[PDB]
Amino acid sequence: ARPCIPKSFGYSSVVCVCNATYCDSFDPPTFPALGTFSRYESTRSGRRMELSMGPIQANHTGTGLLLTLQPEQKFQKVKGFGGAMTDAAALNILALSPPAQNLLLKSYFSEEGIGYNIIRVPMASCDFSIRTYTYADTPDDFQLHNFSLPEEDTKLKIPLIHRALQLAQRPVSLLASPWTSPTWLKTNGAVNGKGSLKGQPGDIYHQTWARYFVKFLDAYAEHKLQFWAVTAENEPSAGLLSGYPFQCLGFTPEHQRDFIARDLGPTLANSTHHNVRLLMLDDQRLLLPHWAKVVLTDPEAAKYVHGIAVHWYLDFLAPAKATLGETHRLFPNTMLFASEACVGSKFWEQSVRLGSWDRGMQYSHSIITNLLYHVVGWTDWNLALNPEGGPNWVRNFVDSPIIVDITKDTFYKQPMFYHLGHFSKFIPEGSQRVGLVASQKNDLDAVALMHPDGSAVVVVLNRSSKDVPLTIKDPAVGFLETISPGYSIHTYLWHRQ
Amino acid sequence: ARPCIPKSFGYSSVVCVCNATYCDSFDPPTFPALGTFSRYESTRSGRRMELSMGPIQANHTGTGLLLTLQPEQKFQKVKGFGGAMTDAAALNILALSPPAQNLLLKSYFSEEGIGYNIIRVPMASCDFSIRTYTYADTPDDFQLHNFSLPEEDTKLKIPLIHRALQLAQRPVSLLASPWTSPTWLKTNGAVNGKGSLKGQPGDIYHQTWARYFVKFLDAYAEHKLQFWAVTAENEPSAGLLSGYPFQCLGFTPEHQRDFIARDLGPTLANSTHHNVRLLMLDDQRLLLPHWAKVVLTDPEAAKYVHGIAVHWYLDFAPAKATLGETHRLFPNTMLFASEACVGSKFWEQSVRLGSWDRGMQYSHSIITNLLYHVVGWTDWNLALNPEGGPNWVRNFVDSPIIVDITKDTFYKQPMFYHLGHFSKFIPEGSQRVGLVASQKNDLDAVALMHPDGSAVVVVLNRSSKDVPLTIKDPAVGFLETISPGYSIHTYLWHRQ
Ligand SMILES: *[C@@H]1O[C@H](CO)[C@@H](O)[C@H](O)[C@H]1NC(C)=O
Ligand SMILES: *[C@@H]1O[C@H](CO)[C@@H](O)[C@H](O)[C@H]1NC(C)=O
Ligand SMILES: O[C@H]1[C@H](O)[C@@H](O)CNC[C@@H]1O
Ligand SMILES: O[C@H]1[C@H](O)[C@@H](O)CNC[C@@H]1O
Numbered sequence: 001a002r003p004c005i006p007k008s009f010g011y012s013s014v015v016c017v018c019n020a021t022y023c024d025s026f027d028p029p030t031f032p033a034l035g036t037f038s039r040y041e042s043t044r045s046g047r048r049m050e051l052s053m054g055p056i057q058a059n060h061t062g063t064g065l066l067l068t069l070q071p072e073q074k075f076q077k078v079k080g081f082g083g084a085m086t087d088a089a090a091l092n093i094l095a096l097s098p099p100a101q102n103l104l105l106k107s108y109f110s111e112e113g114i115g116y117n118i119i120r121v122p123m124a125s126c127d128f129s130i131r132t133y134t135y136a137d138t139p140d141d142f143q144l145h146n147f148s149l150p151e152e153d154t155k156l157k158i159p160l161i162h163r164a165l166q167l168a169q170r171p172v173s174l175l176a177s178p179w180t181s182p183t184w185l186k187t188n189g190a191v192n193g194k195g196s197l198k199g200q201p202g203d204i205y206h207q208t209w210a211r212y213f214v215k216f217l218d219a220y221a222e223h224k225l226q227f228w229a230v231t232a233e234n235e236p237s238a239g240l241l242s243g244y245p246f247q248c249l250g251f252t253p254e255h256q257r258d259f260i261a262r263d264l265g266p267t268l269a270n271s272t273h274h275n276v277r278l279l280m281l282d283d284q285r286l287l288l289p290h291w292a293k294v295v296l297t298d299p300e301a302a303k304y305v306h307g308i309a310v311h312w313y314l315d316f317l318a319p320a321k322a323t324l325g326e327t328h329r330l331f332p333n334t335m336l337f338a339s340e341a342c343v344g345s346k347f348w349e350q351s352v353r354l355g356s357w358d359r360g361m362q363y364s365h366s367i368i369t370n371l372l373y374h375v376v377g378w379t380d381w382n383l384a385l386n387p388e389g390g391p392n393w394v395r396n397f398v399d400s401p402i403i404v405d406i407t408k409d410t411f412y413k414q415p416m417f418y419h420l421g422h423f424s425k426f427i428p429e430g431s432q433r434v435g436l437v438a439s440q441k442n443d444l445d446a447v448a449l450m451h452p453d454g455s456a457v458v459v460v461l462n463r464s465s466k467d468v469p470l471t472i473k474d475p476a477v478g479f480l481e482t483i484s485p486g487y488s489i490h491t492y493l494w495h496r497q
Numbered sequence: 498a499r500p501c502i503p504k505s506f507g508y509s510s511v512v513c514v515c516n517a518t519y520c521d522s523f524d525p526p527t528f529p530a531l532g533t534f535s536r537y538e539s540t541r542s543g544r545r546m547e548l549s550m551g552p553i554q555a556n557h558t559g560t561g562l563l564l565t566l567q568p569e570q571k572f573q574k575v576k577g578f579g580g581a582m583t584d585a586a587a588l589n590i591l592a593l594s595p596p597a598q599n600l601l602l603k604s605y606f607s608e609e610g611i612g613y614n615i616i617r618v619p620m621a622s623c624d625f626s627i628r629t630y631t632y633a634d635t636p637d638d639f640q641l642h643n644f645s646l647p648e649e650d651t652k653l654k655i656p657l658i659h660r661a662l663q664l665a666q667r668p669v670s671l672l673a674s675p676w677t678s679p680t681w682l683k684t685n686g687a688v689n690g691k692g693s694l695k696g697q698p699g700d701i702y703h704q705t706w707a708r709y710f711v712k713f714l715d716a717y718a719e720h721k722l723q724f725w726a727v728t729a730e731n732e733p734s735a736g737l738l739s740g741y742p743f744q745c746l747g748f749t750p751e752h753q754r755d756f757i758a759r760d761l762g763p764t765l766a767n768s769t770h771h772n773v774r775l776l777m778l779d780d781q782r783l784l785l786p787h788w789a790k791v792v793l794t795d796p797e798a799a800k801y802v803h804g805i806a807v808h809w810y811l812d813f814a815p816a817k818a819t820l821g822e823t824h825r826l827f828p829n830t831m832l833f834a835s836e837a838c839v840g841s842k843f844w845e846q847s848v849r850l851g852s853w854d855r856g857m858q859y860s861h862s863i864i865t866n867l868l869y870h871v872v873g874w875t876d877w878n879l880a881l882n883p884e885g886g887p888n889w890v891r892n893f894v895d896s897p898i899i900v901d902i903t904k905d906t907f908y909k910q911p912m913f914y915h916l917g918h919f920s921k922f923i924p925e926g927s928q929r930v931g932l933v934a935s936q937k938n939d940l941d942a943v944a945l946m947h948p949d950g951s952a953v954v955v956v957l958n959r960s961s962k963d964v965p966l967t968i969k970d971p972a973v974g975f976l977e978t979i980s981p982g983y984s985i986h987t988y989l990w991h992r993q
Contacts, residue, residue: 317811319783348741348742358739
């Protein structure tokens with residue numbers, strides 16, 4: 001429908017420029033006829049999810065790299081893909097003119113964009129906020145008589161969420177996560193730094209905090225928003241470290257276990273929101289499988305836990321298999337879910353690198369490794385940031401797939417946006433990842449899934465500089481002859497009957 | 498003989514203040530009779546390797562955790578402990594007046610201090626230099642006729658090293674590591690960034706680079722200094738990273754494999770320096786076991802590799818899966834910690850004067866290393882200024898001694914004493930042995946056997962609670978003690 005308007009900022013690749021009247025968009029999706037495949041291509045050299053089609057060949061010799069589909073090797077089903085509606089993201093989106101806001105939201109949520117179906121919502125303030133607040137800042141208000149949603153929710157977050165759901169291709173799932181409790185529930189009486197809930201699981205500080213989840217959900221329900229899930233706490237390990245700079249609330253895995261068992265599970269289970277799922281951890285995978293053991297080998301906490309949530313930030317010093325794989329080995333019936341990722345990365349590179357192809361590859365690299373190790377979904381951090389990677393009240397600036405330039409009523413779609421798009425647009429909720437074996441050692445990253453309609457989707461990422469010729473075999477159908485260009489990512493689709 | 502002069506700077510504990518006429522020091526060791534032990538204690542509250550003594554008796558009065566010496570279980574033998582004489586360390590030491598310099602050097606190398614017996618020496622410049630330079634900056638000098646040592650070596654590093662050896666109670670070993678080759682040998686023609694050697698193992702570029710190691714060893718040998726070992730490159734993986742900010746030289750594990758096999762191994766071994774050890778990796782431990790499998794399964798490379806050098810940064814990949822697994826796979830190739838440092842969280846503060854937490858990080862990681870077969874442990878810069886500098890790129894990192902040029906004073910941090918709890922009492926040749934815990938506890942502990950047969954046990958308490966403790970020697974009896982919250986003890990006793 002409309003192509004990328006490219007612009008260079010002197011990094012490895014370009015961004016796609018959008019404004020009030022223009023943004024790159026897709027045509028409505030069409031089924032490739034049986035015996036054909038669809039290919040979506042993005043390249044460092046400038047191609048941005050271009051649609052092309054080819055034949056599936058009945059025969060193939062000799063020769064070189066072959067990746068064979070295994071429809072009988074069935075693994076996890078997919079929950080979905082999305083990002084976080086933080087104070088910082090919402091504030092940036094709304095600072096644009098209304099027509100630019102819509103193109104922005106369609107890019108993420110529409111069928112003319114990348115079909116996101118998860119939105120993470122912080123419960124009150126985090127570091128990507130411009131002030132600290134919780135929903136119950138009256139000291140010692142154990143009854144939560146003064147619990148209320150501030151404007152951050154009622155004027156920025158919630159209206160943006162509604163407009164996304166309205167644009168949305170697919171049913172959208174909301175995920176909620178707290179950074180800090182009110183400061184009077186905490187041993188250090190501050191939103192940041194080392195500190196946890198006062199007293200012990202089962203007591204009034206613990207029961208009040210559990211009740212605060214219920215009040216949060218009650219309040220969102222009044223604005224016609226239902227949650228798919230909540231996490232027990234964002235990065236519980238963070239609140240264990242002295243001088244921790246921004247909002248946190250410390251739990252050892254034992255504390256989380258008992259908090260879930262005593263307070264948070266029963267409270268949620270006895271509320272009108274009993275169907276909301278609870279995910280534990282919500283922190284770096286380096287904490288697995290230990291954290292999952294402590295919590296899930298206690299059946300009183302296990303009965304309340306639907307899933308384990310993981311953060312991507314390092315990560316690089318904890319190989320998937322030893323963390324993600326082991327945990328699945330031990331609790332195959334507790335889903336793994338990536339609830340937060342950003343870049344990053346690095347201490348000598350700027351927070352925002354407009355046009356960075358490398359950062360795009362890190363996303364898709366991580367998404368593929370995640371899928372290969374059982375993870376059922378993936379959630380980017382901030383949906384939009386400014387060219388500084390903010391705002392952020394502790395200046396903890398990071399990058400985002402969409403960068404808003406408020407003076408120019410313009411936004412930039414980075415490579416990360418598209419690299420994400422290669423998964424989000426084409427893997428709906430209910431897809432099942434399947435086997436895919438390589439006939440020879442290669443430099444590609446690849447993953448195959450089965451769409452709920454029976455069709456196939458395979459994503460191939462090439463992080464080397466060299467083109468790599470390859471064929472994908474599907475026994476039901478034949479052979480896709482293709483080439484993977486250096487510094488590219490392709491998604492391949494085709495019907496099976 | 499002289500106690501710590503404490504000073505607080507607002508962090509969890511104190512530094513010890515030393516200057517031209519005063520520094521904290523030890524008396525010569527003694528050999529207490531069988532049935533008595535010596536304890537060195539440092540606490541966050543202020544004690545600094547304080548010596549006391551007591552009895553190891555036949556009756557067991559304690560009721561809590563029991564640690565039993567098991568001398569029959571024998572593990573790795575120790576190579577030693579030390580730190581890096583970088584350009585920055587040397588500049589910092591040399592900005593003190595002479596008598597202050599001596600007290601500093603004694604703190605680390607002397608019997609009166611902590612008994613260091615390793616020095617790592619960068620081969621030309623790294624980030625802790627105040628300028629970029631190699632030993633062969635003149636382009637296209639493939640025979641290296643113009644190879645030479647600048648002032649940083651001949652005026653700063655080398656004199657300091659000679660003096661450290663004059664003072665040292667023990668034989669000191671030197672370990673050398675390159676950050677970058679001459680830039681005209683690299684794919685990118687720069688000192689930093691994504692770039693390897695040009696061409697391929699075997700060719701003129703590789704041959705020249707390998708010869709540069711020999712020229713370096715010759716040059717130091719003219720200064721009457723011999724090396725124990727060299728690493729094949731500092732952080733080879735760094736140079737695979739686009740825009741890497743400081744001096745680097747990229748090798749994939751295969752490239753390191755082939756460079757050692759074809760060039761570095763043959764050249765070193767066909768030189769008068771054939772006894773110098775070669776250590777591979779010299780990088781984060783997350784690269785293990787993989788890097789070890791690639792290099793060490795090719796017999797042509799393996800025959801040249803004495804050991805695997807690891808950095809601790811960047812550790813927070815577990816010990817078992819890296820060090821444990823690498824030892825299982827290659828049990829006759831020593832593991833050695835070539836560079837350790839802290840390591841500041843982004844809300845810090847590269848230098849935190851008096852930080853007890855950083856102390857604990859050092860001793861905790863030394864203990865973990867000992868429990869996973871590592872034979873040696875090298876700190877990074879011997880000394881830095883209060884800004885954690887000089888560093889030509891950016892400072893991130895603290896150091897056990899902080900020099901204040903303007904007051905002719907230097908500060909010994911908790912890191913210094915945490916290292917000392919080990920380096921002072923574990924000489925080269927010491928062997929790690931069993932130490933069995935009777936019940937789950939929060940302590941970190943390790944036992945070793947001195948070459949003279951005596952026991953050394955280090956007990957670290959990272960919790961805030963006092964832990965009542967009994968240590969048992971099957972040969973002697975029971976030692977009743979308490980490990981206070983936020984403390985580190987070293988226990989020493991004779992076994993016959
Ligand atoms: C919007 O973008 C297109 C560039 O594709 C351009 O022709 C149009 O003028 C832009 N609008 C504004 C207000 O700059
Ligand atoms: C050096 O340290 C000792 C002990 O603290 C002290 O008595 C002396 O004054 C110090 N020298 C200077 C110049 O302050
Ligand atoms: O608040 C999040 C930070 O803003 C994000 O940059 C990475 N760290 C984890 C935290 O949950
Ligand atoms: O030059 C070294 C750095 O100065 C040290 O701070 C951390 N490790 C990376 C490098 O090998």
